[PDB]
Amino acid sequence: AEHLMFKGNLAGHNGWVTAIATSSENPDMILTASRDKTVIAWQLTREDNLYGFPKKILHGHNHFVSDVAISSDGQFALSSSWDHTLRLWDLNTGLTTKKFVGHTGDVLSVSFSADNRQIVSASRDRSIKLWNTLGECKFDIVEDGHTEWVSCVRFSPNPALPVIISAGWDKTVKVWELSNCKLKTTHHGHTGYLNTLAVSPDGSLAASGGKDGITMLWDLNEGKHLYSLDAGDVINALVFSPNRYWLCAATASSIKIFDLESKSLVDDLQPDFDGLSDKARKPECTSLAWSADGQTLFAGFSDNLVRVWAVVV
């Protein structure tokens, strides 16, 4: 029987866990970003009492950390912050090697290209910027750009159509051709602002989500909308499983796991909140990541914890 099985918590942050990153290079490590202004590198022990412990606490941002990524070689962390900057960290030394300065508003998203030669980020300043790995901004994508905050930006891993995808508070999803940085497609359809966006491991699908409870799937090869899945509530985070045809949506109320083959619901994760139900709103899941091999789901929450589920059968 295959299904997510609660395995434990990672405790250590002192603010909402806002992003989680994972890599094949070290499967025993997790990176988490937080409103406590730190990134933590966790060592996973997978023991029953502690699933893991914080191994390194990366200090330096002056405001909420909003997103984090790991280099393909697993040795560098890349994070964005409401303090207007990105930072590249050496995970061996735990120090920042490069600061990316240039945005003029809160940075809400950051990501590595497949080959790690390019870095892309999105900000409240309504721009998308491309950097190199030395911290130099190489292009400012504004033309025909979003007219509100840009909340999430990602690369397509499809070698044939090199694009970046962005979602914004203008309720649209935009596809940009990477070669010249010109707008390729604007997708309309969402009725509310968007928090998040994820791309298929084969780069055929993009999923977008936000204030309307609806996650919409867009065909990156062809023109347009494919279908929509109704999550129950405001969508905080979206991620595709790397090794199953599944799409997970973290909402205010729950974590829904959608089977894409059937459009059916695989699971609805609602953790037992170790506290109470007295004049208190159940903590929201604010971030999601799969392990590289797709056997472990990590979920960050507004009660400062990471919660871990292990695919069982």
Author numbering: 2 to 314
Question: Which of the paper's sentences describe this entry?
Answer:
Although a classical G protein β subunit was not found for Gpa1 in C. neoformans, Palmer and co-workers reported that a Gpa1-interacting protein, Gib2, could function as an atypical G protein β subunit13. However, based on the amino acid sequence analysis, Gib2 is more closely related to RACK1 (receptor for activated kinase C) protein orthologues than to G protein β subunits. Hence, Gib2, a scaffold protein interconnecting various cellular processes through binding a myriad of proteins, could also bind with the ribosome and function in ribosomal biogenesis and protein translation. Apparently, although not essential, Gib2 is important for growth at the mammalian body temperature and is required for full virulence.
We determined the crystal structure of Gib2 at 2.2-Å resolution by molecular replacement using Asc1 (PDB ID: 3FRX29) as a search model. The asymmetric unit contained one copy of Gib2. The model includes all of the C. neoformans Gib2 residues (314 in total), except for Met1. The electron-density map is well defined apart from the first and last residue, as well as a short stretch of side chains between residues Gly276 and Arg282 in the extended loop linking blades six and seven. the structure features the predicted seven β-propeller fold, with an overall shape that resembles a donut of approximate dimensions 45 Å and 10 Å of the outer and inner circle, respectively, and 30 Å in width. Moreover, all of the seven β-propeller blades are arranged radially around the central axis and comprise four twisted antiparallel β-sheets labelled A, B, C, and D, starting from the inside. The interactions stabilising the β-propeller fold are conserved in blades one to five. The network of inter-blade hydrogen bonds between conserved residues observed in blades one to five is absent in blades six and seven. Deviation from the conserved structural motif in blades six and seven might be necessary to accommodate the extended loop located between these two blades or possibly provide a more dynamic binding site for protein partners. Although the middle portion of the loop seems to have a different conformation in Gib2 and Asc1, the knob-like structure in Asc1 consisting of stacked Pro276, Phe278, and Pro28729 is also observed in the Gib2 structure (consisting of Pro272, Phe274, and Pro284, respectively). Although Arg57, Lys62, Lys87, and Arg102 (Asc1 numbering) are not fully conserved, they are mostly replaced by other positively charged residues in RACK1 orthologues. Based on sequence and structural similarity to mammalian RACK1 and yeast Asc1 discussed above, we propose that Gib2’s positively charged and surface accessible residues Arg36, Lys38, Lys57, His60, His85, Arg88, and Arg100 contribute to the interactions with rRNA.
